[PDB]
Amino acid sequence: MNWIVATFMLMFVLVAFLPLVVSLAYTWVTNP
Amino acid sequence: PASVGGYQITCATCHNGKAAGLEPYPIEIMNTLPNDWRLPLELDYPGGLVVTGRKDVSNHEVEQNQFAMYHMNVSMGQGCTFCHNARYFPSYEIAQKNHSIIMLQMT
Amino acid sequence: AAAPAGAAAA
Amino acid sequence: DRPFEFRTSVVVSTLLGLVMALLIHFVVLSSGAFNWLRA
Amino acid sequence: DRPFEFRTSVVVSTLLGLVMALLIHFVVLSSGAFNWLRA
Amino acid sequence: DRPFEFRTSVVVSTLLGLVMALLIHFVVLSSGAFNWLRA
Amino acid sequence: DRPFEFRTSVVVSTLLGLVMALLIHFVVLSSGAFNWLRA
Amino acid sequence: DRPFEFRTSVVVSTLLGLVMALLIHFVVLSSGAFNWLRA
Amino acid sequence: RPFEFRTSVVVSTLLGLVMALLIHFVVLSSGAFNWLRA
Amino acid sequence: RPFEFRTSVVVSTLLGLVMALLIHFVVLSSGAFNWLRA
Amino acid sequence: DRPFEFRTSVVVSTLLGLVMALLIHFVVLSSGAFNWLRA
Amino acid sequence: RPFEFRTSVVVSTLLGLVMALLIHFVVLSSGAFNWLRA
Amino acid sequence: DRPFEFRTSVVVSTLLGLVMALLIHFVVLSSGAFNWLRA
Amino acid sequence: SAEVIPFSIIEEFYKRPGKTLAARFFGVDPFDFWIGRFYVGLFGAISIIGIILGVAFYLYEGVVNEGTLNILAMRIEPPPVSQGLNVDPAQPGFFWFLTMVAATIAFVGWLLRQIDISLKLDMGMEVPIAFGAVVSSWITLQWLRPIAMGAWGHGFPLGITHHLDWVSNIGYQYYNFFYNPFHAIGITLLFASTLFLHMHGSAVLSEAKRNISDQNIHVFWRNILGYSIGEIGIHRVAFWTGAASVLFSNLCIFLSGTFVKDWNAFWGFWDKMPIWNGVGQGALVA
Amino acid sequence: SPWPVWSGYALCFVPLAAVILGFIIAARFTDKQATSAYLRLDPAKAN
Amino acid sequence: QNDLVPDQWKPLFNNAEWLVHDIVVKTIYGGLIIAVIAHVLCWAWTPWIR
Amino acid sequence: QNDLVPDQWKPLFNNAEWLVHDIVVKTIYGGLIIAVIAHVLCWAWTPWIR
Amino acid sequence: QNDLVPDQWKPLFNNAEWLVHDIVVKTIYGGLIIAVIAHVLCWAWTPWIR
Amino acid sequence: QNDLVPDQWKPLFNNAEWLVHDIVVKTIYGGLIIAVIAHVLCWAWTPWIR
Amino acid sequence: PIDLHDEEYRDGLEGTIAKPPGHVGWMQRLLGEGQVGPIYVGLWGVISFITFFASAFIILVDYGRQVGWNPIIYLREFWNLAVYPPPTEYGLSWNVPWDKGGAWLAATFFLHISVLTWWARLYTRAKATGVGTQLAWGFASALSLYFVIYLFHPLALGNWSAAPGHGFRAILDWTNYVSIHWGNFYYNPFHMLSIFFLLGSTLLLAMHGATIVATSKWKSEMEFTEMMAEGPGTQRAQLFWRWVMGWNANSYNIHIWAWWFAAFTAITGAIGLFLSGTLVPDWYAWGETAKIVAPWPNPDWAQYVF
Ligand code: BCL
Ligand code: BCL
Ligand code: BCL
Ligand code: BCL
Ligand code: BCL
Ligand SMILES: CC[C@H]1c2cc3[nH]c4c(c3C)C(=O)[C@H](C(=O)OC)c4c3nc(cc4[nH]c(cc(n2)[C@@H]1C)c(C(C)=O)c4C)[C@@H](C)[C@@H]3CCC(=O)OC/C=C(\C)CCC[C@H](C)CCC[C@H](C)CCCC(C)C
Ligand SMILES: CCCCCC/C=C/CCCCCCCCCC(=O)O[C@H](COC(=O)CCCCCCCCCCCCCCC)COP(=O)(O)OC[C@@H](O)CO
Ligand SMILES: CCCCCC/C=C\CCCCCCCCCC(=O)O[C@H](COC(=O)CCCCCCCCCCCCCCC)COP(=O)(O)OC[C@@H](O)CO
Ligand code: HEC
Ligand SMILES: CCCCCCCCO[C@@H]1[C@@H](O)[C@H](O)[C@@H](CO)O[C@H]1O
Ligand SMILES: CCCCCCCCO[C@@H]1[C@@H](O)[C@H](O)[C@@H](CO)O[C@H]1O
Ligand SMILES: [Ca+2]
Ligand SMILES: [Mn+2]
């Protein structure tokens, strides 16, 4: 295992979580 | 068969540098099993741990099968697929299953 | 008369 | 009014009859008690 | 007013007949009782 | 007022005929009874 | 008016013809009966 | 009024031609029948 | 009237670029040329 | 005015940047230059 | 108004009796103490 | 009205039934009495 | 005004103290350094 | 207030030209029009090209190169793991690679076309987010994990009943897959999604054609559970749960072959923590 | 023989055909109901 | 409507439904005759009850 | 509306569907003739009932 | 509009649809000729019925 | 608009679509000639029907 | 004639508790509603509570007995403790020792009673207000699979050990063992139908939620008033899905799709599980006879070995 490519791909898998987090944050901010 | 290497059994096997105090079944290998389980060596092989399609058998026997099968795959450093095609467990299409039958008879 | 739900209420 | 409608009776009876017929055919023909459609 | 439409009767009967015909032809074909479509 | 339209009849009959033709060709080919497309 | 438009007929006929042509070419090439594309 | 527009016809024909050219080039390359682009 | 010069420029440029990339990748993968070879 | 100079500048700049990154990645990860490991 | 309803008590008692009958039959007939329906 | 008769009746009846069923289950599983023994 | 309430700080402090006391008691009991509750 | 509108006016009112992504990048959308009921734009052509080529490549690899007309007995399989990350036109697994790339192009084009159609109607971007979750699931199954592991032969085969053999063998290689924490979270979210869908469908159907007010369903859902969520809250919960179910299960399958080899040996730390190790007796030790 | 057993048609193929045909027909009828003329708010005044 | 139908079946049939019904019953009669003939021929070939 | 349709079938057709109906029935007749010829030839080749 | 169409087919065709129809039918006839020739050549090469 | 389109194709074409159509048909003829030449060269190299 | 205030603020057995409602702020900000309570506590609701807590008490006390009445071992081992049905040597008998199957029998009987009484609660509280009874029949469809798993499949097989144990890990073990015992469950056609409907339910839930939130600027989530006249939000949702797929739905029949897709899952699963042991004892062999298994003559097994 290269451990450098694997961590880049893990970073991509984690970045895939971002739009849902942004949706929750937008809902929270826009409803005071 | 000769494809496995032709290795022999000597004193360093079963001992690994110790005269007495040998410990089969140490606490390290009992991670997910009850700490009193032992290999069922009073049965007959092949046929002692077969469960597929049997209507005189239920989940108790399947659990007793699974304990032994996890022991076998922990003592090899491998997964369930060293010896099976996981789409049909009765299948004998891997040679390690025959080797395992011979090694169950030996033990 | 004709309603989104398939009803025809006066 | 009447307790039940004619249409409901027809639907229930027809479906029950069809399902019972198929079930009885499956149970009887798959028992091996009768020599039917055999090579 | 009549309990059932003509259109419903036609649809139900035609669908049931087609399904049953296909099922019976395929059940008889694979039994081996008749010398039909045999190599 | 007619029960069925002409368009629905045409669509249903045409689709049924095409599907049956394809199915029967597939079955007769895979049976192995006729020479046909043998190597 | 009329049952079907002209453009729907054209679309259906052209799509069906193209699909059938591709299917028949694939089946005949896979059958192995002809010396068509061989190394 | 005409059934089809000229723009739609151009687009559809161009798409079909490109797809067929790519498909045939990829099939012929890997068929192994021709001594083309061989290592 | 349904044909504008800018849209055709966009379409042709995209098609040419994609075709060039595809042909480069396929020729590199074939292994018929001693190009970028270990 | 059909073509805006700003749009062409932006499009060409982005295309050049993307092509530079792609060619770097393709050349570096090959039998030759072997990620500069040598 | 009414502290107790006849209908509710009827429903509850009937259901309790049926459940008890089923349970007692199961427990008694699955124990093997009585010679009932022996092959 | 603080205490209602209907609630007391329902709760007491249900508690008694549950207790009777539980005691029968435990005594049957104990094996001390002959009862439904083979 | 105030950043924190008295109620919140009291709740948090009491919970933290109880959890830490239990954790330390468990660790010291399982460590085996002291005799304490021996058989 | 309200009157009968035949739906031709509602469709013709909302059709506008040029508010898409390509219209903002190039200044114009080359294919900005409608074919039948569908909106064709850019990314509506790329997607259709990918769809046609993927179907053609799949059927050629199945019918030919395997010689079977049975659709449920094909094995459209990748190259072996001994080939590494190399592609060769003269070796098995080439039509699997072509089909995989075409399918990727089709799925990404579908996502971008959804973004375009959202932009035309002045909506939010919830549908592209929800679809991009499962698109990323496909990407991690077929691109990221094979690249990290080191071969294209680590992807699953595209056969109808045979991709279930890959699932079975991969799940029993890293036994026990049930003991994967992210697997459990994903299963929990799938079951919760089905429960919530049934609850919402029942709730809306139960009040449809009745001379009642819009506050009856709140009283119904407060008499039974003590709490009623609301009208936008239930649809938000639906969206969030649906997306998260697959977002969490990406991690389990990625970490199965790269950082972990055994999901039974993962839980070996639990009994060794100082809070409760060394407190039991025989067969209750550890 | 190249043919499946009768259980193959009973449990596998008839349910698949039923599912596909039911999906097609349900889609046809739901789209027929959705795109008809009923009470709507006028798009001109509402927006 | 309700013109060509007989007096007995007026509350159940239309003018067009009556004609379609006649077509359907003729189809069923013909199919029944053919089915009887086919069953007799196949029994002569190979009896399936033994 | 329906001038070419015979009086019997007026409640079911208008003259823009009578023509399409005639086309369809002619197609079906031609197909049936070809099908009979094909079946006779195939039986003469190899009988499928033995 | 509906003036180049023959009187029989007026309720079904326009002028533009009539022209496109003529083009389509001529295409079909040419394709059928080519298909017949291709089939004769392929049979002469290797018959597919034995 | 359509003042140089032939009278026969007036209902179908426009003034600019006529010129674009001419360009497209010339493209297709040139492509067909090139394709015929390429096929003849490839057959002379290695026949694919044996 | 239904008085909602009386339905929510009545006293007695046929009435509510937690009468002064609470309020949670983060639920108000995220979900849009934050009031908690009051909750109805009438008959059919006390019976469920009492029987559920009887079964739970039995299970937890047996956990404690197994551990040895040691709280620390209890906390350590809580997620792999279970009570199992009587083993295969017993059949469907009830004369089983308490630490070998009697506890499971008692707890399961009480659980059955509680779920039935909860169904009755849903039904009667739906009728008491002005709404129809659609949740009760969905729960009935869900309970069909529950009673197949716990009562009818063991009854047809002939032993109690065909049923799951009561534990966090025991359900996973039951799933694994039941798949292993009867061939391979991937080749069960009704398991394929169940998975079809489950994944369709998740897809449809995500689609409906996303498209209602995306059009919520024009109050499209007020689906009660949108079934009398549809405004800009519903029109935009219809146009979106028509321009994407070529067909769309209403603000009425989409929830019909939801109900039936969620309902079919449990019914198909119940049929498949019941057939699993009693008619087809091996699903891979059956699939081989039914022509749905691929040959696979030369596997590349270097993928499946470390
Ligand atoms: C890919 C399709 C292209 C297109 C490519 C061509 C080509 C190429 C030609 C035309 C031609 C025409 N096209 Mg154009 N055309 C397109 C779209 C359109 C549209 C539209 C609104 O979409 C319209 C109204 C037209 C209109 C027209 C007419 C103006 C013109 C006359 C047809 C004709 O000759 O009749 C007769 C119609 C026939 C179909 C006869 C053809 C016979 C068939 C095709 C036989 C197959 C050929 C085979 C090899 C020959 C041997 C077979 C047998 C042995 C005989 N085209 C699209 C964009 N078009 C023709 C032209 O301009 O003439 C100078 C012409 O050559
Ligand atoms: C299903 C495919 C086609 C279609 C295929 C045909 C074909 C082919 C024919 C017709 C014919 C007719 N069709 Mg049509 N027809 C269709 C749709 C329609 C629709 C509609 C609005 O959908 C209507 C109202 C009709 C109605 C009609 C009549 C105008 C016409 C004469 C009725 C008839 O045959 O009497 C008598 C009714 C019968 C059912 C005859 C009985 C024969 C049946 C088939 C039994 C078969 C067994 C054996 C062969 C014969 C045994 C005889 C029996 C003991 C009586 N069709 C669809 C689109 N239709 C016929 C026609 O035009 O000829 C004058 C004709 O040949
Ligand atoms: C003989 C061998 C088997 C046996 C095998 C079967 C089979 C197989 C069947 C029965 C059915 C019956 N058997 Mg038995 N049965 C046996 C022993 C018994 C014993 C006993 C104590 O031993 C009893 C009480 C019964 C009792 C029964 C009844 C429940 C039922 C007949 C009455 C009825 O409702 O059908 C009368 C039927 C009707 C009233 C329906 C009318 C049918 C209509 C006309 C449809 C006809 C189909 C036709 C082709 C459609 C053409 C339509 C076109 C448009 C032309 N069976 C033995 C063990 N039994 C049948 C059943 O239907 O179960 C409900 C059934 O199929
Ligand atoms: C034994 C194996 C034989 C063989 C024997 C046969 C036989 C026998 C036949 C063919 C036929 C064909 N074969 Mg061959 N064939 C062989 C090998 C090949 C190879 C190859 C590289 O090996 C290829 C490229 C082909 C190619 C062809 C095509 C030229 C032709 C099928 C046309 C078609 O699909 O119509 C289907 C397409 C349509 C129905 C639609 C397309 C037509 C219109 C004009 C499309 C343009 C319209 C445009 C899209 C706009 C539409 C308007 C609206 C907007 C929709 N053959 C070998 C050696 N082949 C057939 C033929 O002759 O056809 C003429 C035929 O009968
Ligand atoms: C090694 C594992 C095996 C496997 C072995 C099995 C076995 C065995 C079964 C399944 C079943 C299912 N499998 Mg499987 N399955 C496999 C792999 C998969 C994969 C995959 C990607 O690999 C998927 C998607 C699935 C999918 C599924 C589901 C479709 C289905 C169960 C859904 C359901 O309705 O449960 C929801 C559960 C219920 C509806 C019942 C329980 C809920 C009730 C209502 C509880 C309410 C009362 C409760 C006590 C309340 C008290 C709580 C209080 C609030 C405190 N399986 C492989 C092949 N699978 C089940 C099935 O039915 O299919 C035939 C089943 O029995
Ligand atoms: C995120 C939670 C869930 C979810 C939601 C989700 N899916 C979605 C959406 C959303 C929000 C859409 O808006 C979208 C849609 O409906 O658009 C029309 C869609 C969609 N999700 C779909 C399917 C789908 N989603 C699934 C699951 C899920 N989707 C989740 C569990 C699954 C599975 C296996 O669980 C599948 C099958 C489609 C109905 C649609 C996407 C339509 C699309 O992408 O079109 C492009 C391509 C085609 C129409 C044809 C492709 C042909 C191929 C190129 C050829 C074959 C190659 C292929 C790789 C072979 C595969 C064979 C298999 C047997 C392995
Ligand atoms: C084991 C597998 C079994 C598979 C079986 C699948 C079943 C298929 C049958 C589908 C239902 C067909 C319905 C036909 C009749 C509907 C008529 C209609 O149009 O119904 C409308 C609503 O239907 C609508 O949403 C349309 C119908 C309801 C919406 C869809 C409901 C099904 C949801 C999923 C269930 C299965 C479908 C998918 C299966 C994979 C309402 O209109 P009305 O105001 O009443 O109209 C009055 C008059 O104009 C004459 O009707
Ligand atoms: C996994 C398997 C592969 C995937 C297959 C995907 C294909 C199809 C799936 C289902 C598609 C149909 C969806 C609903 C049907 C469309 C509805 C409709 O009817 O829409 C039509 C649009 O289709 C039109 O033009 C035509 C639109 C184009 C249709 C043809 C697209 C084919 C795509 C390629 C398919 C693969 C080919 C591979 C070759 C081997 C037009 O209708 P109108 O008469 O104008 O309507 C009347 C009015 O109310 C609106 O105008
Ligand atoms: C595995 C089958 C073994 C092989 C191979 C050898 N020995 Fe062994 N031996 C084995 C066990 C399980 C034990 C008992 C362990 C214990 O704790 O008592 C032994 C014991 C011995 C002893 C006695 C040790 C003692 O009494 O302290 C001796 C002297 C001994 N074994 C010698 C020995 C030799 C020389 C071997 C090679 C020829 C050999 N053993 C192999 C298991 C196994
Ligand atoms: C967008 C990502 C495209 C695929 C990325 C992989 C680059 C291919 O590059 C590969 C290397 O990754 C590999 O180490 C050796 C042999 O395994 O052969 C090379 O061609
Ligand atoms: C309502 C539930 C149906 C009751 C079914 C009863 C099945 C009885 O079956 C029993 C077995 O369970 C028992 O083990 C042996 C003991 O010899 O005898 C049988 O009769
Ligand atoms: Ca242990
Ligand atoms: Mn909703």
Numbering used by the authors:
A (entry chain Y): 1 to 32
B (entry chain C): 161 to 267
C (entry chain Z): 3 to 12
D (entry chain H), E (entry chain J), F (entry chain N), G (entry chain P), H (entry chain R), K (entry chain D), ...: 3 to 41
I (entry chain T), J (entry chain V), L (entry chain A): 4 to 41
N (entry chain L): 30 to 315
O (entry chain h): 12 to 58
P (entry chain K), Q (entry chain O), R (entry chain Q), S (entry chain S): 6 to 55
Text lifted from the article:
pmcIn the process of photosynthesis, light energy is absorbed by light-harvesting (LH) complexes and transferred to the reaction center (RC), where charge separation initiates electron transport and subsequent formation of a proton motive force. Roseiflexus (Rfl.) castenholzii is a thermophilic filamentous anoxygenic phototroph (FAP) of the family Chloroflexaceae. The Rfl. castenholzii RC complex consists of three large subunits (RC-L, RC-M, and RC-Cyt) and locates to the center of the LH ring, and the relatively low r.m.s.d. value observed between the earlier structure and our higher resolution structure was 2.449 Å. The Rfl. castenholzii LH complex consists of 15 pairs of αβ heterodimers forming an open elliptical ring with a gap at the 16th position, which is occupied by the insertion of the N-terminal TM helix of the Cyt-subunit (Cyt-TM) and flanked by the TMx protein on the outside.
The 15 αβ polypeptides bind a total of 45 BChls (30 on the periplasmic side and 15 on the cytoplasmic side) and 30 Crt molecules (16 γ-carotenes and 14 OH-γ-carotene glucoside esters). Of the latter, 15 γ-carotenes are embedded in the TM region between each αβ polypeptide, whereas one locates between the Cyt-TM and the neighboring α polypeptide, and 14 OH-γ-carotene glucoside esters are positioned between two adjacent αβ polypeptides with one OH-γ-carotene glucoside ester missing in the 15th αβ polypeptide; the 16th chimeric pair does not contain BChls or Crts. The Rfl. castenholzii Crts could be divided into two groups, A and B, based on their biochemistry, orientation, and position in the LH complex. Group A Crts are deeply embedded in the TM region between the α- and β-polypeptides and have all their β-rings pointing toward the cytoplasmic side, a position similar to those in most other LH1 complexes; a comparison of the Crt conformations in Rfl. castenholzii and the purple bacterium Thermochromatium (Tch.) tepidum is shown in Figure 4B. In contrast to group A Crts, group B Crts are positioned between two adjacent αβ heterodimers (instead of inside the αβ heterodimer as in group A Crts), which is similar to that of group B Crts from Rba. sphaeroides and Rba. capsulatus. The Rfl. castenholzii group B Crts were identified as OH-γ-carotene glucoside ester esterified with C14 saturated fatty acids, with the β-ring facing the cytoplasmic side and the glucopyranosyl group facing the periplasmic side of the membrane. Collectively, the group B OH-γ-carotene glucoside esters combined with the group A γ-carotenes fill the space between the adjacent αβ heterodimers resulting in a blockage of the pores observed in the LH1 complexes of phototrophs containing only group A Crts. The tightly sealed LH “fence” of Rfl. castenholzii is thus likely unpenetrable, and as a result, alternative strategies are needed to facilitate quinone transport.
